[PDB]
Design a protein around this nucleic acid. Sequence first.
RNA 1: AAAUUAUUUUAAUUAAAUUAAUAAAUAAUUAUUAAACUAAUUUUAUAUUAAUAUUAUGAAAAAUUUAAAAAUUAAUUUUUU
Lengths: 111, 32, 92, 104, 152, 119, 341, 214, 52, 373, 185, 48, 5
Amino acid sequence: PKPAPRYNIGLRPAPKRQNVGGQFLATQKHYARELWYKRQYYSTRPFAIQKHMGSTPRILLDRTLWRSCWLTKSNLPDVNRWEKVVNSQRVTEDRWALVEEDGVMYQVNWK
Amino acid sequence: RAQHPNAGTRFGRVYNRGFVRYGFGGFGMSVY
Amino acid sequence: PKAGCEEITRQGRRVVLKPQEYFAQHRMQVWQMRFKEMGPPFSRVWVALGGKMRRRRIGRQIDVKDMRYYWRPIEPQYQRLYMSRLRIKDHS
Amino acid sequence: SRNGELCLQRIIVSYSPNKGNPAMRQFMATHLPEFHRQYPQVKIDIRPRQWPESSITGIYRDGSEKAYSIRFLSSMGINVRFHRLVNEGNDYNHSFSASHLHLQ
Amino acid sequence: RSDIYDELLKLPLRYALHDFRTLQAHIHASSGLSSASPDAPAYYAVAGRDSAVGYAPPLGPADPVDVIPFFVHRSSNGHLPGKVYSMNAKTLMPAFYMRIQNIEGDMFRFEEELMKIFPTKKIFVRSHSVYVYNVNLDGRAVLHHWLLGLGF
Amino acid sequence: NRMLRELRLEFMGQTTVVPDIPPVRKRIWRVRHVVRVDQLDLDEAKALIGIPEHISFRDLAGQIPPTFGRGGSVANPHMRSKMNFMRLRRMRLRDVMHRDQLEKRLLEERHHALQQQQQ
Amino acid sequence: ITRLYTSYFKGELFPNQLARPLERLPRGVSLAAARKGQRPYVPLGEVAKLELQGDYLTEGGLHQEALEYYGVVAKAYELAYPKDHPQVAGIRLKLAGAFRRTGRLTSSKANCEAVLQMLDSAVQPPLELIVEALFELGLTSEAMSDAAAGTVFEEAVALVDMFHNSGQSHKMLRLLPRLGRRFNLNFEEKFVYFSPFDYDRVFALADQCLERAEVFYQARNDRAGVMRVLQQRKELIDKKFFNMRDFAGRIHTMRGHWKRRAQVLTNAPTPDELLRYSPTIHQVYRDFKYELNAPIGREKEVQPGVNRVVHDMGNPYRRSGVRSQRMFRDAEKNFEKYIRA
Amino acid sequence: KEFDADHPLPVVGTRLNERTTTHKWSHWDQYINPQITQSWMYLTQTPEYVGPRSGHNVIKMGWMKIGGSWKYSRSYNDARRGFAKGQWQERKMTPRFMLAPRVSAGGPRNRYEGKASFSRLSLSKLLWAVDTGRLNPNETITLYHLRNAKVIADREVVWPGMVLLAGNVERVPYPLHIELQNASAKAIQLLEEAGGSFTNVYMSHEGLYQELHP
Amino acid sequence: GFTMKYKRGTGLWDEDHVNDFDANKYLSARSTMRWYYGMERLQTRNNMNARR
Amino acid sequence: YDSRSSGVHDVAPRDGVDFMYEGPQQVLPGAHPLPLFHPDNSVTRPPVSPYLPSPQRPHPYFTTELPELPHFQTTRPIVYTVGTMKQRIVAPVFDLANNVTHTRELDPFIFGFYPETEEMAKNLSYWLVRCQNFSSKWDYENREIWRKAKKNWPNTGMGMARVGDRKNHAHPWGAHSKPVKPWNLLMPTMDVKTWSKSNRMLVTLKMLQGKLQIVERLTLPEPTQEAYLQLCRTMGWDVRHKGGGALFMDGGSRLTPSSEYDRAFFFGSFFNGRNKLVRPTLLCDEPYDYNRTSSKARTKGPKGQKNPIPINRFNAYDALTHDTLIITEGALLQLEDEMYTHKLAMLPPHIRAQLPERGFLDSEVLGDVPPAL
Amino acid sequence: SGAVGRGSFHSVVAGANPRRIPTYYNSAYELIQLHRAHREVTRNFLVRDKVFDNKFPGCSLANGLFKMVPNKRGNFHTRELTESIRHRTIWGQRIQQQRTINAAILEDATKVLSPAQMEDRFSYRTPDAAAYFSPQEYTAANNWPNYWQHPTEKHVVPKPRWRREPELGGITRVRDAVATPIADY
Amino acid sequence: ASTAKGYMNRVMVYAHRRRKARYLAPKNAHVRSPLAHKMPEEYGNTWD
Amino acid sequence: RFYRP
RNA sequence: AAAUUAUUUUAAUUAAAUUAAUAAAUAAUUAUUAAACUAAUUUUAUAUUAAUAUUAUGAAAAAUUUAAAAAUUAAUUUUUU
């Protein structure tokens, strides 16, 4: 009858043991930041490297974390080739770095 | 200590220039 | 490795579910005998009996030796004190 | 507006055609085709990209630019931040005060 | 009660109410047999036909020409959707609100017919219910004398 | 401060136009050391605002609505906030007594169109 | 602390004070297309005060005296604004309503028939005017004891039932009953009501034309018409009420969540512009040349770029050992037999 | 309002326009047009649930924010530990319980082993059911029928089985037969007037079971 | 203690009346094969345990 | 806020996609006057329905019997309870070969129960809680730390911290005082009274949204997965991870209804994509908590009901993440059967007494009717 | 025990029950709890015969045995199943008994005045039942949940002048000219 | 002067407490004084 | 139970 | 004793009595939630309450009053976002 404490579940990553909050609120553990990349307070968002919290990732790119650190060996195998999903496929395109030549920017190859 | 709101200046006490002179009574705070 | 890196590898006592209390604990018996709570919903007097009704009778006033016989309410300042231990059952 | 001619040229509108926060997708159908009529000489260009660089940004003909955060901000607000761009010229920052009531 | 039924028969309410006497479940073998059709053949009655408690099927629409825009269903046990909860029962506060829970239709054309009853009680509309505040078990009695008059 | 409140005066520099009726004369008297009064005979008021001599004031006021800004002064800011509430209700009911009065006339006609249909 | 409002108290800010747009008839439509189917310095500050003083006189009952004011305003207005202007059509409209009080129906209808020829020739007239433009003409038609043509009232609403967004009136006002966070003091702010007879003038007229159309058939005894007046009118008010409908938010007193107001006073599409522009009917034009997927068949329209090798389903178990990649082997070759056309 | 249409009032936004948020879908906008509840982030909670607790309801000082000032929470840090457990609530002044005299050595309403305390089945309830159709008027309506027809639940039939109370029932219309426990004298003389019966069964607890779960 | 043991097999399917708090929102391809194979195991793991 | 007033944008169009805004006639990709966070048209997630859901149509299905197809009345006679739609429904059921065979009329109590968001939230808020990995939410407790329980230096006269036995939660080797343990996390008790409502107001929502599809048989020619993608290709379902999936309530054929899935399909329904074979039911048994107060002091557990709805019943989460819903009639027979006695018990009494007259309480135990299917 | 009209043995006191055959009762609620009870006894036999069909080859080695230990199934059959048959039988009598009376009532009644009015005298046709059974017939109220679509209130929803767009891909696209929204104050 | 954001937020330079409703009577309650609970004209009644 | 002591 | 983590807010205030092998308890205040328009006046002006939460005994400048006070004590209006 009495509906559950969604608190913050399924949206956002767990809060960190505020003064307030019921007994049924499952905060995060001692000595574990709620925002993985905020090792400092000014460590900036990693560009294209997300950590998949929650369930088994549907489509795990090679450049996202899954219970693991970042390994320049295993995460981005070739730095010149650069992946994405297309039609639910893990395809890999040549990385392009944008340069402007005529007022417009050009998706020129990166290597 | 009787910590009740309305027992003194609400949160602590501050001495802004409109107080250090023209205190309660207008004749000024003892110090400052 | 993270919580203490050596306090969590060597193992101490692990805590488990904590047993609850008698969840009609706060209807203690010094009310289950002294008072009785009467009243319709949203007005419950905890009527009690007279204060001086057993100790000294000879010589007390004639018409005050009986004010000890009525089921008087206890003044609400105590109604809320005693009935406070009963509200706690599911707060919020 | 200076001598009748606007001091703003472009209004860069980076949005995602499918991702989320429809505020922009909700703005480009209600307001934008009407703010496009009052100020047609503004070269509104829009930029469909996956990670929307959430900031409206006007490129004033003086060469300078001015951005504006649109995080979590609804369409009616984006309408305003548009008209906040075509108004100012980004040419000077003066505290409105005594010494700055008469610019020259 | 007739005493309350005037305070509805006086109102300027669209969707008029049944007359009081014809709204009554409470009034020639032997000066006429009882209501629940116990016929002459040694008195076989029919079960749900008479009720001393006051239950009876809905009398039906007010008048044929009009179409009522809301419909208040009955509960699984028969009685009507009015319920008088209380603000903050935990503290036993004697300040009450009602809840009209089993209605379908346009609550707003329903709630716009409560306003004409209680021109002073804060009425809020929600998806399922219609909360009306500061109205206690006497207001519960005003509703059903209306939800019977409407014919539900 | 209570007298000043009954003269619609709290802040310094506030100004009100009170009558010379008796129980006002005491309120002003108690606070003489606070206010600065000025008296006007009524003829000296019917000209301060350009007013025809024939029009009295008990017909000028009989024209302004009684719900002027901050209509009433009921006994506490709650009773105030339920005097403004119902005032914002008798607006709702004024449109709703309107929207059914359209239906009750169409319903009484749909009855006559039906009734006279069979004749 | 109970206020007194003796000294000047500046007006409060509140969403009932927005600069709503004047209801313009749409672009590709002119007046008669539907009606035949049925600057120099001119001291406008001085006449605006004058044209107002006409209203107070035609609202009090000194109609003849208000005629002479509206004359002056009808002269300064046709000097400032060019031909065909809407506002110059507004004053020679009330002016035409000023004759009819004083019986001069020879010029009233005539000065009111000319506002139409001054409104139709325009490009995008205000639908606030053109519905009064022929509501008046309706009245002065009857005032000439024309009993039928005085019922263009039906065609007065025959625009507002077609070209009036009955929801644009209360788009921002619909949600104010959420801004109240108090319940037992300062709680009138949960019942903020604004009558559609104030915040919508093209609706009021539409309600008033049909009311006059009710009494013109009441005398003519056109009972089949008085219904299609009423059954028309009620379907006009009830769909205007319908656009004020919303369910109560939190009922009891809320504290502190003051940043919530950025969610209540927003672009809440009124239930007219919701059912009308529903996503299923009005569908979102999604061009796959900007997205990163398409339905199975159309897997070549997608975002183009430099060389792409389709590696595999980005299945996560490719990061496990070999006994997990010995499973999952025949995953991909099965997936092409699902995207091949 | 524009006095003339040719000079439209400018759009120079304020802190009431330029600072808003995207309209989430309210439970009305999803009740009108269910074509928009397109993901589970649209099933937001009851409107009455504002959200989790976000402030310290310190006593004697409103509801303070978190991170606020603890100058005045001298007794919130002391009403969070909880009430003294196993300790007299009244520190001085001879507790009002101790002042009053012990009465009726078990208590004023005590229930001993074998007390006749019966849950009240108002006759209106039983008469309401018999017409509603949950109870069959023919079959002598023993407590099995009342329990199994969901007229009374498990939480109201304890050992003294029940008690019929003529509550406001001025009349019973049909011959009604009952096997209940200790009807009130009026409730008896009501059934007995309408040609009914009432044979008060007062079964032991061993009989209370075998009547409910035969 | 007492844990409703008269309900273990008296459900209509295999996944019922077995308290398994260890769930997840999206159980993947082989986490679902792992799940279905799991319910029946601790349904036959329990039985032949209790038969031996 | 409004900081970073510069440098956030490049003053240059990416020479590929980027493009000016031509005019008011320009139909911009993605644009729409409603605030939609999932802007899907009828070509991306096309509804499998006879008509597109329109405000005019009370539901995008055959409101009436169309003449050119066998009509199959409901398995059970139908009554319209409190919340139901008061409008007849006829959903055409699809042959396996993508043809549309006979049309079938749905039950207006299960598929006619109009939605109201705040009563599917009690379903969603239950799932987003029941579907945690509770046992993962352990955390070390103050006592569980294994450090010295004795102050090594008693603080007497120098400026050392007023601390000793530093195994508390302040120090980088400590643990909480009131930590989060699983046996302290509430698994919410969910009634059948509202699970049924919270399932019926969705499987109606999936009908009003026009994402409801009925199939004669969810059976494959062979149990290989490839035969289940080949089946999806003919039926057009998009079990790709990104294209909205499909929710199969496999109940078997129209004449052979069965709860235990068709073994053929079950083994074939193991595709890595987005699909979830759920059980053909909406009810689930009463909740119970044998360890109600503290009885078992060793259970790991959560607090609350010790009988959680399993992961593969029809819930709210996997009902809104999966666009299309795929029910075999063999499930419709089970849903109308399991909710019949529930649909009848909720009618008001002056209606409930009219049923045996109208043929609703024909009870095959007495023999007044030959046994139903 | 009671549970049927026979009177529990607590008619030890020879309490007779005269004025009988007096009521025709359609056994509405009882036939409901019969179909509910008949579902349980079948939903119980389904359980008493659960037999391992292990669709997996890991623990296939029990695919012949029942899903319940022989001693337990030999109990559950006798504790819960055979109880539920008695509980099903009870309703199978409280109704087969009440019918016997109705069979007698519906004869002695059919005669007296009419064989046409008879099944009207014994009817329960409330004037609104068209609301619950055939809602297409019901007009006298507006009991839709989506009330703005009731035929007497369909005139609320707007009928947009829509259109298809082959250049966009057959997308339907409303031809309403959006009204310029409010902007500033 | 020194007005600062609101009715009752006048002079704000003297250090009195605004928002204090000086008009309302003191809640003398338990204190014993002739000035108790009496409208100011009844102060001379020091016999009750 | 073992009641918390 | 030391601490108790989230700016841009949106209704006010003090109280000072019964008792204490001397302050977790009571009034009164404050607080959270909620309330109903009884003659008195202007067409003025009015925070009155209920229900719960509550680890408190001492009030600037005055006006005076006890006391060797050499201040404490009574006093009663202050008591700043």
